[PDB]
């Protein structure tokens, strides 16, 4: 996989997470950034990733870190 110069997250999602974590647990964050990675601080949040037509809630666990947000949001439905 790519990118050795800092794991990448969109400015907006970084600031939205930092604001969400410091306040406390609340609700699913409407975010479209699938490209963004998952930090350690994102654990506990049930952020809602855009599959394409709707937002899929994803409870972030200890394992979901190095992976990107789009991996937990299947786009193409089948059967």
């Amino acid at each position: 996989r790519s990118l050795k110069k800092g794991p990448f997250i969109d400015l907006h999602l970084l600031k939205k997470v930092e604001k969400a974590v410091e306040s406390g647990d609340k609700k699913p964050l409407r975010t479209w950034s699938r490209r963004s990675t998952i930090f350690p601080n994102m654990i506990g949040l049930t952020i809602a990733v855009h599959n394409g037509r709707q937002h899929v809630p994803v409870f972030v666990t200890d394992e979901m870190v190095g992976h990107k947000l789009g991996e937990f949001a299947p786009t193409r439905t089948y059967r």
Partner: protein, 66 residues
């Protein structure tokens, strides 16, 4: 035991690469050579090394480091 019907149950010397010399009795032949034994097998360390493999958050910190 019934003599004649059984195979030859002779004594032999087991000697692994670790150094544990050990005489036993079995149907092999002249001598023996072994890799591991009850001593020298990694089960006491094996379970220590095998169980402590996981760790995803520190792996992320080892890349970013800030």
């Amino acid at each position: 035991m019934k003599k004649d019907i059984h195979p030859k149950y002779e004594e032999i010397t087991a000697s692994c690469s670790c150094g544990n010399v050990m005489k036993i009795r079995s149907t092999v032949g002249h001598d023996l050579n072994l890799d591991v034994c009850s001593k020298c097998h990694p089960f006491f360390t094996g379970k220590q090394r095998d169980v402590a493999t996981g760790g995803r958050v520190d792996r992320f910190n080892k890349r970013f480091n800030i």
